[PDB]
Write an enzyme that holds these catalytic residues in place. Structure first.
Site, mmCIF file in Angstrom:
data_model
loop_
_atom_site.group_PDB
_atom_site.id
_atom_site.type_symbol
_atom_site.label_atom_id
_atom_site.label_comp_id
_atom_site.label_asym_id
_atom_site.label_seq_id
_atom_site.Cartn_x
_atom_site.Cartn_y
_atom_site.Cartn_z
ATOM 1 N N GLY A 171 0.793 -1.244 0.000
ATOM 2 C CA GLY A 171 0.000 0.000 0.000
ATOM 3 C C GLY A 171 0.819 1.284 0.000
ATOM 4 O O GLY A 171 2.048 1.252 -0.137
ATOM 5 N N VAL A 198 1.322 3.516 2.502
ATOM 6 C CA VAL A 198 2.197 3.563 3.676
ATOM 7 C C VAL A 198 3.273 2.457 3.578
ATOM 8 O O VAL A 198 4.463 2.717 3.833
ATOM 9 C CB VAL A 198 1.402 3.453 5.007
ATOM 10 C CG1 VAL A 198 2.378 3.316 6.186
ATOM 11 C CG2 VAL A 198 0.492 4.676 5.199
ATOM 12 N N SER A 234 -2.092 -10.665 -2.934
ATOM 13 C CA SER A 234 -0.720 -10.214 -3.143
ATOM 14 C C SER A 234 0.294 -11.329 -2.925
ATOM 15 O O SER A 234 1.434 -11.220 -3.379
ATOM 16 C CB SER A 234 -0.381 -9.043 -2.218
ATOM 17 O OG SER A 234 -1.068 -7.867 -2.611
ATOM 18 N N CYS A 255 -1.833 10.897 11.120
ATOM 19 C CA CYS A 255 -0.830 11.747 10.471
ATOM 20 C C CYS A 255 -1.002 13.227 10.799
ATOM 21 O O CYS A 255 -0.022 13.928 11.136
ATOM 22 C CB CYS A 255 -0.844 11.537 8.953
ATOM 23 S SG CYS A 255 -2.497 11.496 8.253
ATOM 24 N N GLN A 305 -5.385 18.589 3.721
ATOM 25 C CA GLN A 305 -4.822 17.240 3.713
ATOM 26 C C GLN A 305 -4.695 16.655 2.316
ATOM 27 O O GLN A 305 -5.584 16.807 1.480
ATOM 28 C CB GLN A 305 -5.630 16.326 4.643
ATOM 29 C CG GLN A 305 -5.330 16.674 6.108
ATOM 30 C CD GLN A 305 -6.139 15.858 7.112
ATOM 31 O OE1 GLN A 305 -6.865 16.420 7.922
ATOM 32 N NE2 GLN A 305 -5.992 14.534 7.083
ATOM 33 N N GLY A 318 -3.272 10.332 1.984
ATOM 34 C CA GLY A 318 -3.780 9.958 3.313
ATOM 35 C C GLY A 318 -4.885 8.907 3.244
ATOM 36 O O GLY A 318 -5.135 8.185 4.223
ATOM 37 N N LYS A 373 -10.247 12.555 16.200
ATOM 38 C CA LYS A 373 -8.932 11.937 16.445
ATOM 39 C C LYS A 373 -7.898 12.993 16.801
ATOM 40 O O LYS A 373 -7.114 12.802 17.744
ATOM 41 C CB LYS A 373 -8.469 11.125 15.226
ATOM 42 C CG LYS A 373 -9.098 9.770 15.139
ATOM 43 C CD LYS A 373 -8.631 9.043 13.891
ATOM 44 C CE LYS A 373 -9.503 7.824 13.645
ATOM 45 N NZ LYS A 373 -9.407 7.341 12.227
ATOM 46 N N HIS A 392 0.623 16.996 4.210
ATOM 47 C CA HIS A 392 -0.485 17.743 4.811
ATOM 48 C C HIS A 392 -0.027 19.107 5.295
ATOM 49 O O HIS A 392 1.071 19.261 5.835
ATOM 50 C CB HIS A 392 -1.035 17.016 6.049
ATOM 51 C CG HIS A 392 -1.695 15.706 5.775
ATOM 52 N ND1 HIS A 392 -2.177 15.333 4.542
ATOM 53 C CD2 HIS A 392 -2.036 14.706 6.628
ATOM 54 C CE1 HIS A 392 -2.740 14.141 4.629
ATOM 55 N NE2 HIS A 392 -2.667 13.739 5.886
ATOM 56 N N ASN A 420 2.811 13.311 4.905
ATOM 57 C CA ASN A 420 1.890 12.468 5.670
ATOM 58 C C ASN A 420 2.200 10.964 5.624
ATOM 59 O O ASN A 420 1.707 10.197 6.452
ATOM 60 C CB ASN A 420 0.465 12.708 5.154
ATOM 61 C CG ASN A 420 0.328 12.414 3.657
ATOM 62 O OD1 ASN A 420 0.872 13.126 2.820
ATOM 63 N ND2 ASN A 420 -0.376 11.347 3.326
HETATM 64 N N1 LIG Z 1 -1.881 7.050 4.053
HETATM 65 C C1 LIG Z 1 -1.631 7.794 5.145
HETATM 66 O O1 LIG Z 1 -1.123 9.121 5.108
HETATM 67 C C2 LIG Z 1 -1.884 7.223 6.501
HETATM 68 C C3 LIG Z 1 -1.391 7.908 7.609
HETATM 69 C C4 LIG Z 1 -1.482 7.335 8.872
HETATM 70 C C5 LIG Z 1 -2.067 6.081 9.010
HETATM 71 N N2 LIG Z 1 -2.542 5.413 7.915
HETATM 72 C C6 LIG Z 1 -3.144 4.083 8.114
HETATM 73 O O2 LIG Z 1 -2.367 3.068 7.501
HETATM 74 C C7 LIG Z 1 -3.194 2.019 7.011
HETATM 75 C C8 LIG Z 1 -2.879 1.724 5.539
HETATM 76 O O3 LIG Z 1 -3.148 2.871 4.753
HETATM 77 P P1 LIG Z 1 -2.645 3.070 3.232
HETATM 78 O O4 LIG Z 1 -2.879 4.516 2.945
HETATM 79 O O5 LIG Z 1 -1.274 2.543 3.040
HETATM 80 O O6 LIG Z 1 -3.692 2.113 2.419
HETATM 81 P P2 LIG Z 1 -3.627 1.442 0.947
HETATM 82 O O7 LIG Z 1 -2.722 2.160 0.022
HETATM 83 O O8 LIG Z 1 -5.013 1.241 0.441
HETATM 84 O O9 LIG Z 1 -3.005 -0.020 1.238
HETATM 85 C C9 LIG Z 1 -3.740 -1.001 1.927
HETATM 86 C C10 LIG Z 1 -2.761 -2.101 2.339
HETATM 87 O O10 LIG Z 1 -3.434 -2.964 3.247
HETATM 88 C C11 LIG Z 1 -3.341 -4.291 2.770
HETATM 89 N N3 LIG Z 1 -4.473 -5.128 3.173
HETATM 90 C C12 LIG Z 1 -5.814 -4.903 2.955
HETATM 91 N N4 LIG Z 1 -6.500 -5.937 3.494
HETATM 92 C C13 LIG Z 1 -5.621 -6.807 4.042
HETATM 93 C C14 LIG Z 1 -5.781 -8.012 4.709
HETATM 94 N N5 LIG Z 1 -7.000 -8.496 4.904
HETATM 95 N N6 LIG Z 1 -4.669 -8.688 5.172
HETATM 96 C C15 LIG Z 1 -3.400 -8.172 4.974
HETATM 97 N N7 LIG Z 1 -3.246 -6.976 4.303
HETATM 98 C C16 LIG Z 1 -4.337 -6.312 3.849
HETATM 99 C C17 LIG Z 1 -3.250 -4.151 1.264
HETATM 100 O O11 LIG Z 1 -2.739 -5.323 0.682
HETATM 101 P P3 LIG Z 1 -3.166 -5.814 -0.803
HETATM 102 O O12 LIG Z 1 -2.365 -5.019 -1.817
HETATM 103 O O13 LIG Z 1 -2.808 -7.280 -0.842
HETATM 104 O O14 LIG Z 1 -4.653 -5.597 -0.970
HETATM 105 C C18 LIG Z 1 -2.299 -2.972 1.175
HETATM 106 O O15 LIG Z 1 -0.966 -3.423 1.409
HETATM 107 C C19 LIG Z 1 -4.631 2.463 7.259
HETATM 108 O O16 LIG Z 1 -5.034 1.855 8.460
HETATM 109 C C20 LIG Z 1 -4.526 3.962 7.484
HETATM 110 O O17 LIG Z 1 -5.529 4.500 8.326
HETATM 111 C C21 LIG Z 1 -2.462 5.968 6.658
#
Ligand SMILES: NC(=O)c1ccc[n+]([C@@H]2O[C@H](COP(=O)([O-])OP(=O)(O)OC[C@H]3O[C@@H](n4cnc5c(N)ncnc54)[C@H](OP(=O)(O)O)[C@@H]3O)[C@@H](O)[C@H]2O)c1
Ligand SMILES: NC(=O)c1ccc[n+]([C@@H]2O[C@H](COP(=O)([O-])OP(=O)(O)OC[C@H]3O[C@@H](n4cnc5c(N)ncnc54)[C@H](OP(=O)(O)O)[C@@H]3O)[C@@H](O)[C@H]2O)c1
Ligand SMILES: Nc1cc(C(=O)O)ccc1C(=O)O
Ligand code: NA
Lengths: 359, 357
Positions: free
Chosen positions: B11, B13, B39, B127, B154, B158, B222, B251, B324
């Site tokens: 993903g 992050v 994956s 973030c 933002q 994110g 939050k 952000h 972020n």
């Molecule tokens: N983006 C930000 O700025 C930010 C900041 C702070 C916190 N976060 C938190 O970080 C987390 C990830 O965010 P992201 O932005 O990186 O999301 P993203 O780009 O949509 O990526 C989602 C990730 O989660 C994996 N995933 C989904 N379902 C799964 C499962 N059942 N078992 C194992 N892996 C699974 C996906 O794997 P696949 O490719 O195999 O589907 C992918 O690696 C969220 O909880 C979010 O709230 C994000």
């Protein structure tokens, strides 16, 4: 009917001045389009009619009843006093005359009364100020206003046609050519007149206009000073942060206020809904709130996300959006002209109260 | 050295978690990449090595020392407790465990001390909260904090990889096909899980996450609750408005505070400049202030536009910007892991405090 001149007819605001006049009830017998020597001799439509653009000069205003100025502060400073001398009533979109005690600074829904004592120039406030005044006046009337803190999310059309084109070009270079936003070359934003220019594409620039000696920008200080004049209350505390974002049209604002008396949120919603020029778009259960892309093309000011502060008893937060070229500029100006017509105020001013700059 | 697992490696992050680990001092003997079943079997680089992605399951955590979770709150709720039982220390980027009193909610520059008493899970804050804490802690230390009002600007990253692609596609449709922004079709923003979706192209959407009962969104709440926990002071008044804008990364925040004692602006600037993780970018004479496009790729949090309120004696405004996905997520997590290493805190937790399943 009236002879109406649009000064700055070719610019971002001018194009909307034309549209707003085409859609106006004003009885217009003659339209004249004025701009710089650069546009002189070119043609622009008024409805089906071809109008030859004229260079703005001190002698251009004979026979004009109403002149709408949106051609930059220096143009208003140079030519509006000659227009007044010639017998015109000027509605000025620029900042130049806004804080002059002889000049009404008007949002028609808020302080139309100020028009009666005009001396030939009526100033439109800053676009960001206008929409804030539409949202907050119905609240002030019922519960008072002690302070305002506002953070803005301003569209680039605010900085003129050149700034729109710069933003579109930058975005295309990133999205189609793969240019890094940091590697973009900018010529206009954040401020055409200032020394350094930065990319707006995929960015947020916390500078609108130039800096003043207190480290707030002129845009921020205009929000402060214009609010105090429009609401006729120097005691209202106002501080602003003004930020440009990658939007072409419609400004958004996160507005915090503290009222004098506790204002129940459901009553606040009702008061704003009931206020002319304001539309309540606030239904969070269905994710309804104002949005820049929805506000474009509308004369209305949209208000939502209305909620009390989590701690301050009299604190309220809201989200305010309006098309900065319409209510923020051309529509406020045409609405002023219509209000002048309604009140019989379109006539020459005998006593000149404004310095002539071209003697 | 350690066996380190990245949960959510694929993903937005996760990609940055890989980069931050590649650039880390952590002694890593084995790296494992975990994601969903779809994956599993794909290959992903760690430096020059090829790492085969594994499916995340309840049995996948044997022999793991540190697991960095960034795979959605559901995935942390499901698997983090099994990782703890297996002897792992979890650093979680999700919101799931943040308000659990058995879980430290850590920004290493502000409350590293909270790590000492960990029970196997350390939560990374939101973030938008993290960068605000970096900016404000040095002010709080010297003059206290009575209240915060923040409005955010933002970036779409994110909301994950999908939101980035949606934003880019929408902008192309407007710029290349002449679609009016109000006529665009959206599937993700403002909130993937919510009922309606709106365009972000040339827009500002005053909704991040879903709405709570009090008409603030979960993102805004939050910022409120996480600030109180991190700064260990429930008396700090915090209200937020969280807005998505057409920025891919970094952000920005317009932050207003009132301090407990009057904080001279030159001293505030100096205190922020001196605080680890914060960089003062504030020279208005040369139009110097933090910018999203400049912050992308840096672990630092940039602060400027610092100025006193025009009326409130103790009021101060500033502008705060950070990437972020770095300080807001992957760098905060890796920095936590480095801090756990420094403090000898990477070891199994004897007592399990987190319900299985
Ligand atoms: N983006 C930000 O700025 C930010 C900041 C702070 C916190 N976060 C938190 O970080 C987390 C990830 O965010 P992201 O932005 O990186 O999301 P993203 O780009 O949509 O990526 C989602 C990730 O989660 C994996 N995933 C989904 N379902 C799964 C499962 N059942 N078992 C194992 N892996 C699974 C996906 O794997 P696949 O490719 O195999 O589907 C992918 O690696 C969220 O909880 C979010 O709230 C994000
Ligand atoms: N855009 C907004 O949201 C907004 C809101 C409120 C107020 N305003 C104010 O309205 C004014 C117009 O802004 P804009 O955004 O429309 O700018 P713009 O697109 O850059 O257009 C500027 C206009 O001014 C004319 N002009 C320049 N120099 C002139 C001169 N020496 N004599 C006569 N005309 C001259 C130009 O004519 P040529 O084509 O011949 O160069 C053009 O018509 C500014 O004062 C601005 O502060 C703008
Ligand atoms: N700097 C500005 C000033 C005015 C004004 O006071 O007429 C309007 C718009 C802008 C802008 O650049 O967005
Ligand atoms: Na520092």
């Amino acid at each position: 009917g009236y002879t109406v001149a649009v000064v700055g007819a070719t610019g971002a605001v001018g194009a909307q001045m034309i549209k707003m006049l085409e859609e106006s009830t004003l009885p217009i017998d003659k339209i004249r389009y004025l701009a710089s020597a650069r546009s002189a001799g070119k043609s622009l439509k008024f409805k089906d009619q071809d109008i030859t653009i004229e260079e703005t000069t001190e002698t251009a205003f004979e026979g004009v009843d109403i002149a709408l100025f949106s051609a930059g502060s220096s143009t208003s400073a140079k030519y509006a006093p000659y227009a007044v001398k010639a017998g015109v009533v000027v509605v000025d979109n620029t900042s130049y005359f806004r804080q002059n005690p002889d000049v009404p600074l008007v949002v028609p829904e808020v302080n139309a009364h100020a028009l009666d004592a005009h001396n030939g120039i009526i100033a439109c406030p800053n676009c960001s100020t206008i929409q804030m005044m539409v949202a907050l006046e119905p609240v002030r009337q019922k519960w008072g206003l002690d302070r305002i803190i506002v953070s803005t999310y301003q569209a680039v059309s605010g900085a003129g046609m050149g700034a729109i084109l710069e933003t579109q070009r930058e975005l295309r270079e990133v999205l189609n050519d793969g240019v890094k936003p940091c590697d973009l070359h900018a010529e206009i934003l954040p401020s055409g007149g200032d020394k350094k220019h930065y990319p707006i594409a995929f960015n947020a620039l916390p500078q609108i206009d130039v800096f003043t000696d207190n480290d707030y920008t002129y845009e921020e200080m205009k929000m402060t000073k214009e609010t105090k004049k429009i609401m006729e209350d120097d005691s209202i505390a106002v501080s602003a942060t003004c930020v440009r974002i990658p939007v072409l049209s419609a400004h958004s604002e996160s507005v915090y206020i503290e009222t004098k008396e506790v204002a129940p949120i459901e009553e606040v919603k009702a008061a704003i809904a009931a206020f002319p020029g304001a539309v309540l778009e606030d239904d969070v259960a269905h994710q309804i709130y104002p949005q820049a892309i929805n506000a474009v093309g509308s004369r209305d000011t949209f208000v939502g996300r209305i909620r009390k502060d989590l701690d301050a008893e009299k604190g309220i937060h809201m989200w305010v959006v309006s098309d900065n070229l319409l209510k923020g500029a051309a529509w406020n100006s045409v609405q002023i002209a219509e209000t002048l017509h309604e009140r019989g105020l379109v006539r020459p001013t005998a006593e000149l109260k404004f310095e002539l700059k071209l003697e």
